[PDB]
Design a protein around this nucleic acid. Structure first.
Length: 207
RNA sequence: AGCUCUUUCUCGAUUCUGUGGGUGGUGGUGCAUGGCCGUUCUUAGUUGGUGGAGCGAUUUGUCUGGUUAAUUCCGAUAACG
């Protein structure tokens, strides 16, 4: 949005630059091209950082529009997102799934794990492909974190970022939790937040 | 064998006689059947419900690999129980 109270600050841009979020792959799909700045002299694509903040605020404006927070469902089958989805679902009251998704969880009405959500958020479209294709049987809207070579086939909001691993995946979930809590009125739009980004990251060498 | 022939005593309503109808049968059909037994077959095999795939007969589950006397376990996984 145009508003100064929604503008991206220097201190967020330095946190993007520090985590590698702007660095894509060597390949580009034709659906992702509007999110790209340029290709480097070494064959790597640069993701446009202002495009990310608009698509992340549009995603937060979808998540705030659900009146019961337990109706939102949150997923990661790769390890680099598992700590991050567990912390996101603690900070705001969504339902997490981590590890293997069981086929038929959304469509086998009798099943012990059966559930019926209103919004679905996924960490990587190529890896999390079961809950994406299974959402096509039940009228379920979708948000996803997309790299330059991600296949867009059932996602309704794609957020441009490096999703390969490490600090970049944890930072995106932390920043999405910050803005949903801000615009619902639970924390300040000006005072810094008490939760450090480093709480969401995956398994750097411990000692 | 009073079976039958000659003879002349005996019993007492129980039988005899014609028609209808029964009853019995190690008689016929095991290619009309039940029950029982043998064999395919001594091996590891077989099947619903709800979900997914095909216009359909059908299929997945019931598996690439390792392990076991074993569809026995581990694990993998559009299937779950």
């Amino acid at each position: 949005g145009a508003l100064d109270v929604l503008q991206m600050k220097e201190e967020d841009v330095l946190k993007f630059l520090a985590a590698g979020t702007h660095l894509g792959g060597t390949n580009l799909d034709f659906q992702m091209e509007q999110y790209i700045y340029k290709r480097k002299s070494d064959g790597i694509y640069i993701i446009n950082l202002k495009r990310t903040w608009e698509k992340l605020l549009l995603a937060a404006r979808a998540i705030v529009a659900i009146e019961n927070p337990a109706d939102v469902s949150v997923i990661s089958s790769r390890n680099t997102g598992q700590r991050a989805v567990l912390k996101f679902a603690a900070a705001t009251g969504a339902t997490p799934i981590a590890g293997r998704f069981t086929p038929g969880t959304f469509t086998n009405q009798i099943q012990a794990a059966f559930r019926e959500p209103r919004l679905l958020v996924v960490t990587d479209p190529r890896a999390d492909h079961q809950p994406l294709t299974e959402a096509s049987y039940v009228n379920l809207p979708t948000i996803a974190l997309c790299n330059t070579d991600s296949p867009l086939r059932y996602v309704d909001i794609a957020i441009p970022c490096n999703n390969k691993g490490a600090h970049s995946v944890g930072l995106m979930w932390w920043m999405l939790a910050r803005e949903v809590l801000r615009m619902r009125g639970t924390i300040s739009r000006e005072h810094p937040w008490e939760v450090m980004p480093d709480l969401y990251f995956y398994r750097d060498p411990e000692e």
